[PDB]
Model the fold of this input.
Amino acid sequence: FVNQHLCGSHLVEALYLVCGEQGFFYTPKT
Amino acid sequence: GIVEQCCTSICSLYQLENYCN
Done:
């Protein structure tokens, strides 16, 4: 795991990867 | 406020884990 500033989407993506499911629930349908 | 916090201050894993078990 690289200790980084993680801005924007990268933060919620890394947090989802480490927690493993049941966090963040959104997908676009545009 | 986590996004602005991390984007200015490096999140250590010990702290980052505290947001999600």
Remarks:
- The first helix of chain A runs from residue 9 to 19.
- Chain A touches chain B at residues 1, 3-8, 11, 14-15, 18-19, 23 (CB under 8 Å).
